[PDB]
Amino acid sequence: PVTASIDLQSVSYTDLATQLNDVSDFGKMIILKDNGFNRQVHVSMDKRTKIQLDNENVRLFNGRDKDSTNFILGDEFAVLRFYRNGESISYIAYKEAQMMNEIAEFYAAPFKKTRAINEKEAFECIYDSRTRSAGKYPVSVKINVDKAKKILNLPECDYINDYIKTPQVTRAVPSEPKTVYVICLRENGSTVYPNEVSAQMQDAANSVYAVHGLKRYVNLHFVLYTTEYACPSGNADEGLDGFTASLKANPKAEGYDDQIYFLIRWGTWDNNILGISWLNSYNVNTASDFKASGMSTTQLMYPGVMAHELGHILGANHADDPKDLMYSKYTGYLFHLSEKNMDIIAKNLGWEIADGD
């Protein structure tokens, strides 16, 4: 048996799909290669999280913790994200030639303002060298997000006061995890990109499961569709008030008032604000009245914003450690470190310390 491999110098949608679709319930060793770079990862299907984007099914895959590697697969796109030298790198491949060209143009465009000779380390269109004809269209893009911000001299977005505090409202580990829907609603007039949205959802889900063995208690089911609602101004607080009001006012949403809701967009709000949520608004026993709602950017350059806002929804406050997901400034980290926050989030999902981790 020769070990399955993915050549990142030529990685296409069909490469990722064929390899990931071969992953069984017992997992599969896959070698990631990039010229001299070589990493063996053990990949498994993520059975905890379901995603539909406008009814399109998206599957997630995980490496081991030591592998530092995540995958996303839809019919239309696939993503490999992993870390090298402590920097997050995404390979993004769309199946359809025209969509892939469009996506490559979209990601390339911001780098045409200013050019560096190290640009390739931040952003690269990947071409199929196996087509010795010499592929004209790229088959994927590679983006090093940490490096990309440095070249782009981005205007730095942040949280500021990104939550609003509201009045406050036998038990064992459940026989099956409780399904909690996270209903993500594409803001009227927003374009969001499937690879970007699913990456936010994956990081949000994984931030929960990493805490107190919470997969025992909850399995998150993300769905995305479009809402007629759009924020009336640039202000995040006013936007969130209107969004929650839009849910309550919609006869279509009657009977789903106990789920979690995000208004999503690609852009940000006034004061370069990344998102906003109602603090401590979801509890598995008392969830009601569309209280568990928030708003989030989904752009690639700000990974973990949805995770951070979901953190607030589940009760997490800002943490003191700059490496915490819940730090008060955006720092790109994707896990809760605060024991106080972990206990709050876990309790709201049905855990108590006697259950262990």
| Residues in binding site | 76, 162, 308, 312, 318
Strand-pairing partners, residue 182, are 222, 260
196 is catalytic: no
Does the protein bind Zn ion through residue 324 (CB under 5 A)? Answer: no
Contact region with Zn ion (CB under 5 A), list: 17-25, 122-130, 159-167, 343-351: 159-167
Ordered alpha helix ranges (H), 93-186: 97-108, 119-122, 145-152
Does the protein bind Zn ion through residue 258 (CB under 5 A)? Answer: no
300-331 burial code (b ≥16 CB/10 A, e <16): bbbbbbbbbbbbbbbbbbbbeeeebbbbbebe
Number of residues that bind Zn ion (CB under 5 A): 2
Q: Yes or no: say if 248 and 279 are a contact pair by the CB < 8 Å rule.
A: no
Shortest distance in whole angstroms from residue 36 CB to Zn ion: 40
Contact region with Zn ion (CB under 5 A), list: 148-156, 161-169, 175-183, 186-194: 161-169
Q: Which residues are annotated as a binding site for Zn(2+)?
A: 162, 308, 312, 318
Which of the residues 119, 124, 309, 352 is marked catalytic?
309
Using CB atoms, what's the residue nearest to Zn ion?
162
Distance CA 9, CA 36 (A): 11
Q: Of 162, 187, 196, 258, which lies in the binding site for Zn ion, with binding defined by CB under 5 A?
A: 162
All residues at 6 or more sequence positions from 272 whose CB lies less than 8 Å from its CB, including other chains: 155, 156, 157, 158
Q: Which residues are annotated as a binding site for Mg(2+)?
A: 76
Does the protein bind Zn ion through residue 243 (CB under 5 A)? Answer: no
Q: Which candidate, 152, 147, 219, 227, places its Cα nearest to that of 192?
A: 227
Q: Of 77, 159, 243, 261, which lies in the binding site for Zn ion, with binding defined by CB under 5 A?
A: 159
Residues in the site for Zn ion, rule: CB under 5 A?
A: 159, 162
**Active-site residue numbers?**
309
